[PDB]
mmCIF file of C-alpha atoms in Angstrom:
data_model
loop_
_atom_site.group_PDB
_atom_site.id
_atom_site.type_symbol
_atom_site.label_atom_id
_atom_site.label_comp_id
_atom_site.label_asym_id
_atom_site.label_seq_id
_atom_site.Cartn_x
_atom_site.Cartn_y
_atom_site.Cartn_z
ATOM 1 C CA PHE W 1 -25.193 5.611 18.625
ATOM 2 C CA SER W 2 -25.491 3.897 21.965
ATOM 3 C CA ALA W 3 -23.652 1.182 24.283
ATOM 4 C CA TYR W 4 -25.132 -2.247 25.132
ATOM 5 C CA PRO W 5 -27.145 -1.499 28.365
ATOM 6 C CA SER W 6 -25.922 -2.772 31.893
ATOM 7 C CA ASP A 25 -5.833 -31.014 37.316
ATOM 8 C CA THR A 26 -8.639 -33.500 37.018
ATOM 9 C CA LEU A 27 -12.322 -32.856 36.730
ATOM 10 C CA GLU A 28 -12.959 -33.923 40.019
ATOM 11 C CA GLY A 29 -10.326 -31.619 41.162
ATOM 12 C CA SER A 30 -11.458 -28.417 39.077
ATOM 13 C CA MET A 31 -15.113 -28.846 40.391
ATOM 14 C CA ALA A 32 -13.625 -29.023 43.923
ATOM 15 C CA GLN A 33 -11.724 -25.475 43.274
ATOM 16 C CA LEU A 34 -14.852 -24.515 41.574
ATOM 17 C CA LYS A 35 -17.215 -25.477 44.374
ATOM 18 C CA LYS A 36 -14.823 -23.790 46.957
ATOM 19 C CA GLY A 37 -14.439 -20.679 45.086
ATOM 20 C CA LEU A 38 -17.950 -20.135 44.582
ATOM 21 C CA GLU A 39 -18.029 -20.176 48.388
ATOM 22 C CA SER A 40 -15.062 -18.171 48.824
ATOM 23 C CA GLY A 41 -16.021 -15.455 46.249
ATOM 24 C CA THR A 42 -12.706 -15.886 44.499
ATOM 25 C CA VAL A 43 -14.154 -17.212 41.444
ATOM 26 C CA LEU A 44 -16.341 -13.939 40.849
ATOM 27 C CA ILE A 45 -13.252 -11.798 41.726
ATOM 28 C CA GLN A 46 -11.200 -13.617 39.289
ATOM 29 C CA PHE A 47 -14.292 -12.896 36.662
ATOM 30 C CA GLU A 48 -14.212 -9.100 37.379
ATOM 31 C CA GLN A 49 -10.213 -8.940 36.896
ATOM 32 C CA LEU A 50 -10.542 -10.289 33.277
ATOM 33 C CA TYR A 51 -10.289 -7.969 30.119
ATOM 34 C CA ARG A 52 -13.583 -7.827 28.527
ATOM 35 C CA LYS A 53 -11.501 -6.773 25.648
ATOM 36 C CA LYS A 54 -8.246 -8.714 24.607
ATOM 37 C CA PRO A 55 -5.679 -5.810 24.857
ATOM 38 C CA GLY A 56 -3.700 -5.532 21.231
ATOM 39 C CA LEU A 57 -6.111 -6.868 19.064
ATOM 40 C CA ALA A 58 -7.084 -4.176 16.164
ATOM 41 C CA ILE A 59 -10.793 -3.100 15.857
ATOM 42 C CA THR A 60 -10.659 -0.896 12.696
ATOM 43 C CA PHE A 61 -12.945 -2.195 9.733
ATOM 44 C CA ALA A 62 -16.056 -1.784 12.594
ATOM 45 C CA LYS A 63 -15.708 1.661 13.029
ATOM 46 C CA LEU A 64 -15.078 2.633 9.404
ATOM 47 C CA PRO A 65 -17.680 5.452 8.520
ATOM 48 C CA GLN A 66 -19.645 3.271 6.265
ATOM 49 C CA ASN A 67 -20.180 0.458 8.765
ATOM 50 C CA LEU A 68 -20.811 2.189 12.509
ATOM 51 C CA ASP A 69 -24.261 2.320 11.840
ATOM 52 C CA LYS A 70 -24.046 -1.842 11.007
ATOM 53 C CA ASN A 71 -23.247 -2.328 14.395
ATOM 54 C CA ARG A 72 -26.142 -2.683 16.636
ATOM 55 C CA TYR A 73 -24.179 -1.508 19.800
ATOM 56 C CA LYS A 74 -21.022 1.030 19.516
ATOM 57 C CA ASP A 75 -19.383 -0.693 22.111
ATOM 58 C CA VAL A 76 -19.731 -4.271 20.972
ATOM 59 C CA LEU A 77 -17.650 -4.761 17.783
ATOM 60 C CA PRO A 78 -15.786 -7.664 16.410
ATOM 61 C CA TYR A 79 -12.040 -8.062 16.182
ATOM 62 C CA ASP A 80 -10.517 -7.679 12.937
ATOM 63 C CA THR A 81 -8.389 -11.222 13.248
ATOM 64 C CA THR A 82 -11.833 -13.304 13.822
ATOM 65 C CA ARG A 83 -14.079 -11.158 11.896
ATOM 66 C CA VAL A 84 -16.386 -12.865 9.608
ATOM 67 C CA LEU A 85 -15.765 -12.049 6.156
ATOM 68 C CA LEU A 86 -18.580 -12.482 3.249
ATOM 69 C CA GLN A 87 -17.425 -14.872 0.039
ATOM 70 C CA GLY A 88 -15.749 -12.693 -2.173
ATOM 71 C CA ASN A 89 -18.248 -9.802 -1.159
ATOM 72 C CA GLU A 90 -16.603 -6.640 0.782
ATOM 73 C CA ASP A 91 -19.693 -5.654 2.966
ATOM 74 C CA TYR A 92 -19.105 -5.600 6.469
ATOM 75 C CA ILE A 93 -20.987 -7.335 8.895
ATOM 76 C CA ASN A 94 -20.592 -7.613 13.254
ATOM 77 C CA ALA A 95 -19.855 -11.061 13.472
ATOM 78 C CA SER A 96 -17.200 -13.422 15.223
ATOM 79 C CA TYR A 97 -15.547 -16.628 14.472
ATOM 80 C CA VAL A 98 -15.558 -18.334 17.914
ATOM 81 C CA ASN A 99 -13.896 -21.427 18.275
ATOM 82 C CA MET A 100 -13.681 -23.988 21.444
ATOM 83 C CA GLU A 101 -11.251 -26.846 21.494
ATOM 84 C CA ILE A 102 -11.053 -29.611 23.531
ATOM 85 C CA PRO A 103 -7.666 -30.615 22.430
ATOM 86 C CA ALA A 104 -7.595 -33.879 25.085
ATOM 87 C CA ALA A 105 -10.667 -35.150 22.824
ATOM 88 C CA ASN A 106 -9.787 -34.021 19.591
ATOM 89 C CA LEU A 107 -12.713 -31.834 19.443
ATOM 90 C CA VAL A 108 -13.350 -28.131 18.314
ATOM 91 C CA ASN A 109 -17.164 -26.767 18.716
ATOM 92 C CA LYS A 110 -17.514 -23.981 16.197
ATOM 93 C CA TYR A 111 -19.560 -21.023 16.576
ATOM 94 C CA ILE A 112 -20.025 -17.643 14.391
ATOM 95 C CA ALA A 113 -21.213 -15.309 17.227
ATOM 96 C CA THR A 114 -23.072 -12.119 15.909
ATOM 97 C CA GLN A 115 -25.801 -9.465 16.835
ATOM 98 C CA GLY A 116 -29.217 -9.226 16.019
ATOM 99 C CA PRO A 117 -29.314 -7.920 12.682
ATOM 100 C CA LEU A 118 -30.858 -4.688 12.173
ATOM 101 C CA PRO A 119 -33.279 -3.947 9.150
ATOM 102 C CA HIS A 120 -30.113 -3.128 6.579
ATOM 103 C CA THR A 121 -28.040 -6.035 7.802
ATOM 104 C CA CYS A 122 -30.452 -8.670 7.422
ATOM 105 C CA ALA A 123 -28.939 -9.334 3.674
ATOM 106 C CA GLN A 124 -25.356 -9.826 5.380
ATOM 107 C CA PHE A 125 -26.540 -12.135 7.922
ATOM 108 C CA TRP A 126 -28.397 -14.530 5.555
ATOM 109 C CA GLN A 127 -25.424 -14.124 3.086
ATOM 110 C CA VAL A 128 -23.183 -15.525 5.842
ATOM 111 C CA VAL A 129 -25.420 -18.505 6.285
ATOM 112 C CA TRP A 130 -25.360 -18.985 2.643
ATOM 113 C CA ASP A 131 -21.706 -19.064 2.467
ATOM 114 C CA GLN A 132 -21.287 -21.224 4.601
ATOM 115 C CA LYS A 133 -24.316 -23.169 4.513
ATOM 116 C CA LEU A 134 -25.349 -23.022 7.934
ATOM 117 C CA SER A 135 -28.034 -25.466 9.356
ATOM 118 C CA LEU A 136 -28.548 -23.712 12.752
ATOM 119 C CA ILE A 137 -29.262 -20.708 14.153
ATOM 120 C CA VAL A 138 -29.390 -20.156 17.834
ATOM 121 C CA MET A 139 -31.093 -16.968 18.700
ATOM 122 C CA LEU A 140 -31.123 -15.719 22.493
ATOM 123 C CA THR A 141 -33.666 -12.893 22.368
ATOM 124 C CA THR A 142 -36.950 -11.815 22.019
ATOM 125 C CA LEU A 143 -37.599 -9.325 19.042
ATOM 126 C CA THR A 144 -38.566 -6.668 21.608
ATOM 127 C CA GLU A 145 -38.081 -5.648 25.291
ATOM 128 C CA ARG A 146 -39.355 -2.915 27.431
ATOM 129 C CA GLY A 147 -40.935 -1.379 24.204
ATOM 130 C CA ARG A 148 -37.389 -1.081 22.003
ATOM 131 C CA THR A 149 -36.740 -3.290 19.144
ATOM 132 C CA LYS A 150 -33.714 -5.359 20.056
ATOM 133 C CA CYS A 151 -33.490 -7.724 16.785
ATOM 134 C CA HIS A 152 -35.077 -7.166 13.440
ATOM 135 C CA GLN A 153 -37.465 -9.721 12.350
ATOM 136 C CA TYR A 154 -35.351 -11.440 9.647
ATOM 137 C CA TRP A 155 -37.712 -14.099 8.947
ATOM 138 C CA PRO A 156 -41.312 -14.200 7.552
ATOM 139 C CA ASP A 157 -44.312 -15.169 9.735
ATOM 140 C CA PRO A 158 -45.557 -18.018 7.861
ATOM 141 C CA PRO A 159 -46.576 -18.385 5.422
ATOM 142 C CA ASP A 160 -45.206 -15.126 3.806
ATOM 143 C CA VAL A 161 -42.093 -15.110 1.706
ATOM 144 C CA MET A 162 -39.631 -12.310 2.465
ATOM 145 C CA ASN A 163 -36.803 -10.982 0.030
ATOM 146 C CA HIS A 164 -33.290 -10.244 1.743
ATOM 147 C CA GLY A 165 -30.152 -9.385 -0.579
ATOM 148 C CA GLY A 166 -31.532 -11.836 -3.046
ATOM 149 C CA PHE A 167 -32.297 -14.300 -0.875
ATOM 150 C CA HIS A 168 -35.924 -15.540 -0.696
ATOM 151 C CA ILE A 169 -36.810 -16.880 3.182
ATOM 152 C CA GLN A 170 -39.975 -18.736 4.159
ATOM 153 C CA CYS A 171 -40.482 -20.104 7.448
ATOM 154 C CA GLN A 172 -42.003 -23.669 6.590
ATOM 155 C CA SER A 173 -42.818 -24.947 9.995
ATOM 156 C CA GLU A 174 -43.103 -22.780 13.486
ATOM 157 C CA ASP A 175 -43.571 -24.697 16.764
ATOM 158 C CA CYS A 176 -43.808 -23.009 20.343
ATOM 159 C CA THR A 177 -42.455 -24.968 23.333
ATOM 160 C CA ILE A 178 -42.150 -23.674 26.647
ATOM 161 C CA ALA A 179 -38.777 -21.884 26.539
ATOM 162 C CA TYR A 180 -38.139 -21.553 23.154
ATOM 163 C CA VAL A 181 -39.801 -21.703 19.535
ATOM 164 C CA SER A 182 -38.283 -24.008 16.778
ATOM 165 C CA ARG A 183 -39.019 -22.796 13.196
ATOM 166 C CA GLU A 184 -37.420 -24.386 9.995
ATOM 167 C CA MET A 185 -36.965 -22.055 7.397
ATOM 168 C CA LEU A 186 -36.168 -22.499 3.644
ATOM 169 C CA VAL A 187 -33.636 -20.340 1.972
ATOM 170 C CA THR A 188 -33.500 -19.609 -1.734
ATOM 171 C CA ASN A 189 -30.528 -18.343 -3.849
ATOM 172 C CA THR A 190 -32.996 -15.904 -6.053
ATOM 173 C CA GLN A 191 -29.450 -15.661 -8.648
ATOM 174 C CA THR A 192 -28.980 -19.443 -9.004
ATOM 175 C CA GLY A 193 -32.695 -21.136 -7.927
ATOM 176 C CA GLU A 194 -30.786 -23.155 -5.322
ATOM 177 C CA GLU A 195 -32.327 -23.850 -2.002
ATOM 178 C CA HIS A 196 -30.945 -24.534 1.681
ATOM 179 C CA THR A 197 -32.614 -25.149 4.875
ATOM 180 C CA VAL A 198 -31.857 -23.899 8.267
ATOM 181 C CA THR A 199 -33.050 -25.064 11.780
ATOM 182 C CA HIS A 200 -33.903 -21.508 13.587
ATOM 183 C CA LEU A 201 -34.523 -22.045 17.554
ATOM 184 C CA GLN A 202 -35.503 -18.611 19.134
ATOM 185 C CA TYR A 203 -34.966 -18.712 23.158
ATOM 186 C CA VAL A 204 -37.777 -16.567 24.441
ATOM 187 C CA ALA A 205 -37.380 -16.818 28.171
ATOM 188 C CA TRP A 206 -34.079 -15.154 28.631
ATOM 189 C CA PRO A 207 -33.737 -11.572 29.220
ATOM 190 C CA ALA A 208 -31.129 -9.250 28.127
ATOM 191 C CA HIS A 209 -28.474 -8.840 30.746
ATOM 192 C CA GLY A 210 -29.570 -11.490 32.836
ATOM 193 C CA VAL A 211 -30.042 -15.116 33.546
ATOM 194 C CA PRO A 212 -32.442 -17.656 32.007
ATOM 195 C CA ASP A 213 -35.734 -17.594 33.366
ATOM 196 C CA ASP A 214 -35.584 -21.483 34.452
ATOM 197 C CA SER A 215 -32.043 -23.079 34.859
ATOM 198 C CA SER A 216 -33.400 -26.570 33.911
ATOM 199 C CA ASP A 217 -35.064 -25.431 30.313
ATOM 200 C CA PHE A 218 -31.933 -23.802 29.585
ATOM 201 C CA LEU A 219 -29.652 -26.883 30.449
ATOM 202 C CA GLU A 220 -32.280 -29.072 28.335
ATOM 203 C CA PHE A 221 -31.806 -26.341 25.306
ATOM 204 C CA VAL A 222 -28.066 -26.502 25.459
ATOM 205 C CA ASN A 223 -27.860 -30.233 25.313
ATOM 206 C CA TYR A 224 -30.452 -29.921 22.305
ATOM 207 C CA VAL A 225 -28.464 -27.643 20.369
ATOM 208 C CA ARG A 226 -25.420 -29.869 20.871
ATOM 209 C CA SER A 227 -27.442 -33.008 19.450
ATOM 210 C CA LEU A 228 -28.424 -30.604 16.338
ATOM 211 C CA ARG A 229 -24.879 -29.933 15.466
ATOM 212 C CA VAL A 230 -23.611 -30.831 11.989
ATOM 213 C CA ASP A 231 -20.210 -32.051 11.784
ATOM 214 C CA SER A 232 -17.271 -29.491 11.267
ATOM 215 C CA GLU A 233 -20.420 -26.954 10.525
ATOM 216 C CA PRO A 234 -20.767 -23.896 12.844
ATOM 217 C CA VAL A 235 -23.837 -22.823 15.083
ATOM 218 C CA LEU A 236 -24.772 -19.418 14.354
ATOM 219 C CA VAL A 237 -25.658 -17.834 17.859
ATOM 220 C CA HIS A 238 -26.707 -14.522 18.369
ATOM 221 C CA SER A 239 -29.070 -12.495 20.847
ATOM 222 C CA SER A 240 -29.081 -8.811 20.638
ATOM 223 C CA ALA A 241 -25.232 -7.800 21.146
ATOM 224 C CA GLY A 242 -24.431 -11.204 20.677
ATOM 225 C CA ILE A 243 -21.889 -11.455 23.585
ATOM 226 C CA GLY A 244 -23.876 -11.868 27.191
ATOM 227 C CA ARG A 245 -26.230 -14.317 26.794
ATOM 228 C CA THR A 246 -24.346 -16.233 23.939
ATOM 229 C CA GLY A 247 -21.380 -16.350 26.129
ATOM 230 C CA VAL A 248 -23.155 -18.009 28.333
ATOM 231 C CA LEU A 249 -24.547 -20.446 26.132
ATOM 232 C CA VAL A 250 -20.877 -21.250 24.741
ATOM 233 C CA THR A 251 -19.503 -21.868 28.306
ATOM 234 C CA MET A 252 -22.481 -24.221 28.840
ATOM 235 C CA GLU A 253 -21.629 -26.193 26.008
ATOM 236 C CA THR A 254 -17.962 -26.482 26.575
ATOM 237 C CA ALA A 255 -18.447 -27.613 30.004
ATOM 238 C CA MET A 256 -20.825 -30.351 28.779
ATOM 239 C CA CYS A 257 -18.273 -31.877 26.681
ATOM 240 C CA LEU A 258 -15.480 -31.707 29.150
ATOM 241 C CA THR A 259 -17.687 -33.307 31.685
ATOM 242 C CA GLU A 260 -18.687 -35.917 29.783
ATOM 243 C CA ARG A 261 -15.270 -36.588 29.130
ATOM 244 C CA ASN A 262 -13.958 -36.308 32.372
ATOM 245 C CA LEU A 263 -11.879 -33.439 31.557
ATOM 246 C CA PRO A 264 -11.093 -30.223 33.967
ATOM 247 C CA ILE A 265 -13.446 -27.472 33.732
ATOM 248 C CA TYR A 266 -11.925 -23.736 34.318
ATOM 249 C CA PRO A 267 -14.845 -21.527 33.432
ATOM 250 C CA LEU A 268 -12.573 -18.328 33.990
ATOM 251 C CA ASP A 269 -10.348 -20.359 30.990
ATOM 252 C CA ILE A 270 -13.086 -20.690 28.811
ATOM 253 C CA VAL A 271 -14.549 -16.914 29.370
ATOM 254 C CA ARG A 272 -11.050 -15.958 28.485
ATOM 255 C CA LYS A 273 -10.741 -18.076 25.431
ATOM 256 C CA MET A 274 -14.301 -16.521 24.066
ATOM 257 C CA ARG A 275 -13.209 -13.115 24.768
ATOM 258 C CA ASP A 276 -9.841 -13.512 22.668
ATOM 259 C CA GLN A 277 -12.312 -14.264 19.794
ATOM 260 C CA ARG A 278 -15.074 -11.764 20.446
ATOM 261 C CA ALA A 279 -14.817 -9.143 23.031
ATOM 262 C CA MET A 280 -17.209 -9.240 26.284
ATOM 263 C CA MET A 281 -18.623 -12.575 25.993
ATOM 264 C CA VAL A 282 -20.567 -13.514 29.264
ATOM 265 C CA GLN A 283 -21.788 -9.932 30.258
ATOM 266 C CA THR A 284 -22.196 -9.816 33.913
ATOM 267 C CA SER A 285 -21.477 -11.378 37.038
ATOM 268 C CA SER A 286 -24.499 -12.635 37.531
ATOM 269 C CA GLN A 287 -24.296 -14.641 34.241
ATOM 270 C CA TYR A 288 -20.915 -15.763 35.264
ATOM 271 C CA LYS A 289 -22.112 -17.027 38.746
ATOM 272 C CA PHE A 290 -25.083 -18.797 37.109
ATOM 273 C CA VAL A 291 -23.151 -20.678 34.456
ATOM 274 C CA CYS A 292 -20.536 -21.718 37.069
ATOM 275 C CA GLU A 293 -23.456 -22.950 39.231
ATOM 276 C CA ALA A 294 -25.416 -24.258 36.448
ATOM 277 C CA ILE A 295 -21.828 -26.722 35.791
ATOM 278 C CA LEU A 296 -21.377 -27.739 39.182
ATOM 279 C CA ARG A 297 -25.178 -28.908 39.122
ATOM 280 C CA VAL A 298 -24.549 -30.820 35.681
ATOM 281 C CA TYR A 299 -21.024 -32.399 37.444
ATOM 282 C CA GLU A 300 -23.088 -33.479 40.681
ATOM 283 C CA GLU A 301 -25.786 -34.652 38.854
ATOM 284 C CA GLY A 302 -23.815 -36.771 36.676
ATOM 285 C CA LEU A 303 -21.472 -38.033 39.262
ATOM 286 C CA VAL A 304 -21.460 -41.852 39.994
#
């Protein structure tokens, strides 16, 4: 599961 | 203070750098608010992004239905005007969360959905297409969805959707606005299109009904929109505007609202522009 990108 | 004074301070603080520093100091997630349900094993893949989760206290619950959804109540009060602007702020649905998304819309008979993302960016899916291309009819969790009208303007697409409850035979109509000229982690492609869109959304509000607002994560572009609507209400009522108080207030209800410094600078500048345009 991925973080919301910057 | 006053609107005039708050705008002087915002202008000066934009020129200083101080408004941006105070923004970067602000917590993204309110310390002390529990986040439990969102991290349960059966719910982890119902979050589009691992770090964008609802607080327990403001999490949207389905009526008489235990299913989890990544969605938060966000209410912005303007007490001097006996006004509360209600929102449900949520993520772009996943294939397996469309059923819960439409159940929220049904439960609360929400008449307006504001979607601030394209379906895909750079070859990756940022939101499931949870409505059918006209004239098709699509099943989601015992709701049939059809798009009855679809019209493109410059910056957004306006769709009228019919939601049918398969269990009961009841129907509900929803206006759906998809703003397609606003990339993730950025500012709107056109400031004027954005401001016009925000004022259009305001005009479509139904009394005491939340507007469902979402993007991909449902925090960055949604936070900007919410901040701007709030500021428009304040400016029209000659009430002071403190964008940092507005962002904090949102973040007490859904973490991380307004993602980037560039987004915050954008909305502060836009607030100043609207005040000055309107000033007599």
